[PDB]
Structures are given as C-alpha cells and as structure tokens.
Design an enzyme around this catalytic site. Structure first.
Site, PDB file in Angstrom:
ATOM      1  N   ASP A 285     -37.768  11.325  -8.214  1.00  0.00           N
ATOM      2  CA  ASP A 285     -36.800  11.070  -7.161  1.00  0.00           C
ATOM      3  C   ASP A 285     -36.903   9.682  -6.566  1.00  0.00           C
ATOM      4  O   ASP A 285     -36.084   9.335  -5.726  1.00  0.00           O
ATOM      5  CB  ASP A 285     -36.897  12.132  -6.059  1.00  0.00           C
ATOM      6  CG  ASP A 285     -38.215  12.115  -5.311  1.00  0.00           C
ATOM      7  OD1 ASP A 285     -39.078  11.246  -5.588  1.00  0.00           O
ATOM      8  OD2 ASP A 285     -38.463  12.975  -4.423  1.00  0.00           O
TER       9      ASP A 285
ATOM     10  N   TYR B 109     -43.047   1.349  -6.784  1.00  0.00           N
ATOM     11  CA  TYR B 109     -44.374   1.677  -7.310  1.00  0.00           C
ATOM     12  C   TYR B 109     -45.070   0.483  -7.990  1.00  0.00           C
ATOM     13  O   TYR B 109     -46.297   0.473  -8.109  1.00  0.00           O
ATOM     14  CB  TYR B 109     -44.322   2.902  -8.233  1.00  0.00           C
ATOM     15  CG  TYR B 109     -44.333   4.210  -7.463  1.00  0.00           C
ATOM     16  CD1 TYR B 109     -43.220   5.022  -7.405  1.00  0.00           C
ATOM     17  CD2 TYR B 109     -45.465   4.613  -6.788  1.00  0.00           C
ATOM     18  CE1 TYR B 109     -43.241   6.215  -6.672  1.00  0.00           C
ATOM     19  CE2 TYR B 109     -45.493   5.785  -6.038  1.00  0.00           C
ATOM     20  CZ  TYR B 109     -44.385   6.585  -5.990  1.00  0.00           C
ATOM     21  OH  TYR B 109     -44.453   7.749  -5.247  1.00  0.00           O
TER      22      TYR B 109
END
Ligand SMILES: NC(=O)c1ccc[n+]([C@@H]2O[C@H](COP(=O)([O-])OP(=O)(O)OC[C@H]3O[C@@H](n4cnc5c(N)ncnc54)[C@H](O)[C@@H]3O)[C@@H](O)[C@H]2O)c1
Ligand SMILES: O=P(O)(O)OC[C@H]1O[C@@H](O)[C@H](O)[C@@H](O)[C@@H]1O
Ligand SMILES: [Mn+2]
Length: 436
Positions: A170, A256
C-alpha cells in the site's frame, strides 16, 4: 448476485477490524455473501470477531459471518483470501528492530536485517495458508499483503510457481494519495503513472492526468522542497523524500529508499529501547484489540472510535479488478520475465499491470538507468539469497544476504547480527546448517 465469499487470514490481527469496516463501505461496488475470519489462536480472533460481528449486523446482516481456527471451515467455498498474517506478531517485530540497532544498523519491519528476519518467519506462514486455499478452494485468489512482500514474493515464485497469489503493498498508493493532494486532484485515480522497482524500492518515471497532461514537473518542484507533504522535521519519512529524490532528479522515489541511501540517519530515528513495534502496540494493539471487547459487550457501534481504514481500499480495488475484469492499471509485484529488459528476468518486480480476471498483465518498462539497476540488482540479490537460505536451510546463504545489504556496513557485523537473529527466531525459522 453476483456476490463474493471472502476469508481474511490473520483475523486476530488489529488491521482486520479496520478492513471489515472498509469492506462494508465498498459493498455497492463489491458485494459480499460470506465473510470468514481465520487465525491460529482462538482468543485473539474471537475478540476481534465479536466487533466485526456487530459491524456486519448493523450495515449488512444478510452477510454470513464466522470466525474459526479450522482450515477446512475457513477456506472452503471462498473466492478470495485476504491475508495479513504476521508470523511472530509484534513481539518478534520488536526484536527485528532492536537487534540490528544494537550494532548501529537500520532496525525496520521490512528493510535491512529486521526485514530479512521477518521474511524468514513469513515464508512458512504464507505457504501454509496458500496450501489450505488450494486444498479447499482451488480456484480462489490469495491477495497477500503479509510482509515483507519482496521476500515472500520470491518464495512463492520459486516454491509455488503456478499458484494464484498476488503479493501487494500500500506504500505506493499512500504516496500517490499525497501526490494527488499536492496537485489539487480529487483522487490518485485521476493519474496515470509509470513506475518500476522492487517492493519498497522503486521510482515513478511518468505521471500524467487522464487527458495526458504532464504532472511531473509540478510534483518534482514541490517534492524537491517539501517531500511528499502538502502545502499547509528533516528526517520524517515523507519530508525525507526530498533528499532521496535529489539522487535522481528525473524521477520520484518510493519513501522506503531512505533506509538504503541514508541508513545512518534512519538508525537514529528509532528509539533503540522503544521502537516502532512499541509505538504500534500503544497506539493500536491494546487500543483496538480490546475496544473490540467493549463493542462485543455493548453489541453496538458507539459513534465508534475504530476508524474506517480507507487506505485498504486498494485490496478491494484489486479483488474488483479480478472479479469483474476491469483492466485497471495497478502496481503489483510480478515476475519480471522481460518487463524490465535489462534486469534479472527471474526477479520479482513492482510494475504497472493491467489487472483482469486472469490476473495481472505487466506492462513493459524497457531499459532502466545504471543507478537504479545497480541498486536493484544488489537488493534483489539479498532477497533471492534469503529465499535460498530458507529452502536450502543454509546459514551461509543468509549471511551472504546480510553482507549484500546496503544497510549492513561489513561482513563481521553481518555475522554478529545473524547470530543474534538465529537465537531470537528459533521457534519461527527452519534450523540452519553450518552451524546453529
Ligand atoms: N504489504 C503492505 O502494503 C502492508 C501494509 C500494512 C500492513 N501489512 C502487513 O499486514 C500484516 C498484519 O499487520 P498488523 O499490524 O495488523 O499485525 P497483527 O499482528 O495485528 O496481525 C497479524 C495476525 O496474523 C495472525 N497470524 C500470525 N501467524 C499466523 C499463522 N501462521 N497462521 C494464521 N494466522 C497467523 C496473528 O495471530 C495476528 O492476529 C503484517 O504482515 C503487516 O506487515 C502489509
Ligand atoms: O509501522 P506500521 O504502522 O505497521 O506500517 C508498516 C507498513 O507501512 C506501509 O505503508 C507499507 O506499505 C507496509 O508494507 C508496512 O508493513
Ligand atoms: Mn508495503
């Protein structure tokens, strides 16, 4: 009607109340006849199931609801399995974070040595649920958001090559939501994007609206000053994207990538005594994994405090695309096999796919630049070695996985961290040879 039968694996989770809720809000566009909860521990799920039970009765009582710990009850007569299992639960997540941090290394749920450890725990759990699905409903799809998706996806690719499992994430959706806010759009679905990478490791290369107008120059100027924070702390994840994005000005990064390009900044973001698993156990866990106890006693919605998780709308979008063959363009993790021309054909990559009733049809990416290539070949190698370690029961392959990680500074620290994770994870990993 047509109506779908669904089982949530990991019913005793603290995400499931939030997604049953979201599944009820989306009942017009995705109708349900049966909803079952599956978990291995009765008393965690039962207490979640009591609040779900109340929800179902208020909005759509004609939906058959049940919670069970028996595989045959759970996985018979379903069309979809939504899996968000967390092998080892938040107690192991805590150690995934804290062990690496003791050595000055990134401690995170899905990235660095903590991600590798969670990966090693998860493979067995996901294969278990997948085999139950194939044994009792051979034609259903498993929609797996059980992390860490990159390692689990590599495991399924190798070990269950023909299985109807889709590993999903997600994060891109969340970033695209913020992009839409920045651009003044009503919704991310007004954008058509190109993207490539690995899970939790990728780049947007093209962003336009439905008419074909280029939105990227606008987004880039904003992100280069504020990260993914709409107009209204340098090391906060969304703010930090500004520093990540400067590494490659022609694209926009997955957040990330901060753990890999700025690992030592991230080491000092987490309290080594009180990590994110501890921030989640106070914030959620005992919050909802026992406000469900009130909702069961009362047997009502209170003006309830458990919010609708509108972030998990993407799982329903995916189930819908498969159910009605919509052809929606979504980022999924799939076997490369040419999608990225100059990248390992056997790698799991996160790329745009046209999703229909036969599954995803990946769209070609073409040739990627050397920067992203180098980063991605290193990282996929970590993930592939981790799966090899699991399948071969090899300590050496797991050590190599840690050596390769951009988060790990040297092979000795890699080994020290590995020896500690072996100990912490004895109940959850296969026994490794040479020589724990
Ligand atoms: N990929 C993504 O984009 C994404 C996003 C958010 C959360 N997640 C993942 O969703 C999962 C759930 O997160 P959470 O915060 O709700 O954790 P949680 O611990 O609250 O939920 C996990 C549940 O899985 C159950 N479970 C564990 N092992 C099992 C097994 N072997 N068989 C059956 N059930 C088992 C546990 O009892 C627990 O109730 C995690 O894997 C998390 O990483 C993924
Ligand atoms: O720390 P949390 O609240 O559990 O968030 C962790 C989650 O972040 C999401 O954005 C990622 O897509 C998931 O893969 C990850 O598991
Ligand atoms: Mn994710």
């Amino acid at each position: 009607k047509k109506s779908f039968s669904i089982v949530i694996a990991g019913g005793g989770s603290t995400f499931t109340p939030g997604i049953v809720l979201m599944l009820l809000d989306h009942l017009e566009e995705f109708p349900i006849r049966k909803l079952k909860l599956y978990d291995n521990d009765k008393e965690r799920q039962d207490r979640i199931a009591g609040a779900c039970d109340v929800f179902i009765r208020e909005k759509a009582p004609d939906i058959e609801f049940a919670a069970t710990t028996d595989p045959e009850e759970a996985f018979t007569d379903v069309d979809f399995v939504m899996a968000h299992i967390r092998v080892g639960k938040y107690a192991m997540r805590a150690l995934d974070e804290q062990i690496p941090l003791k050595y000055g290394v990134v401690g995170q749920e899905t990235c660095g040595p903590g991600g590798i450890a969670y990966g090693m725990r998860s493979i067995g759990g996901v294969l278990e649920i997948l085999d139950y699905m194939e044994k009792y409903s051979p034609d259903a799809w498993m929609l797996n958001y059980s992390n860490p998706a990159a390692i689990v996806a590599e495991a399924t690719r190798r070990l269950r090559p023909n299985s109807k499992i889709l590993n999903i994430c997600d994060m891109p959706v969340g970033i695209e939501d913020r992009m839409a806010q920045i651009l003044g759009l009503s919704s991310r679905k007004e954008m058509k994007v190109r993207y490539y990478g690995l899970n939790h490791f990728g780049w947007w290369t093209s962003i336009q609206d439905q008419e074909g107008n280029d939105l990227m120059p606008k987004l880039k100027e904003h992100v280069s000053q504020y990260g993914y924070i709409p107009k209204t702390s340098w090391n906060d994840t969304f703010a930090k994207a500004r520093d990540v994005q400067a590494a490659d000005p022609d694209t926009l990064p997955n957040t990330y990538l901060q753990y890999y390009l700025f690992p030592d900044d991230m080491v000092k973001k987490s309290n080594p005594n009180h990590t994110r698993a501890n921030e989640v156990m106070e914030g959620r866990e005992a919050f909802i994994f026992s406000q469900c106890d009130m909702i069961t006693r009362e047997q009502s919605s209170e003006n309830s405090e458990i919010k609708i998780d509108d972030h998990a709308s993407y799982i329903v979008d995916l189930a819908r695309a498969i159910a009605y063959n919509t052809g929606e363009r979504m980022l999924l993790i799939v076997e490369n096999n040419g999608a990225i021309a100059n990248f390992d054909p056997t790698a799991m990559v996160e790329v745009p796919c046209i999703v229909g009733s036969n599954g995803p049809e990946p769209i070609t990416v073409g040739t990627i630049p050397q920067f992203q290539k180098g980063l991605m070949e290193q990282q996929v190698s970590v993930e592939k070695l981790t799966v090899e370690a699991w399948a071969e029961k090899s300590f050496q392959k797991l050590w190599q996985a840690l050596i390769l990680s951009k988060t790990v500074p040297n092979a000795r620290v890699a080994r020290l961290i590995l020896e500690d994770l072996v100990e912490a994870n004895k109940d959850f990993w296969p026994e490794l040879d040479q020589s724990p």
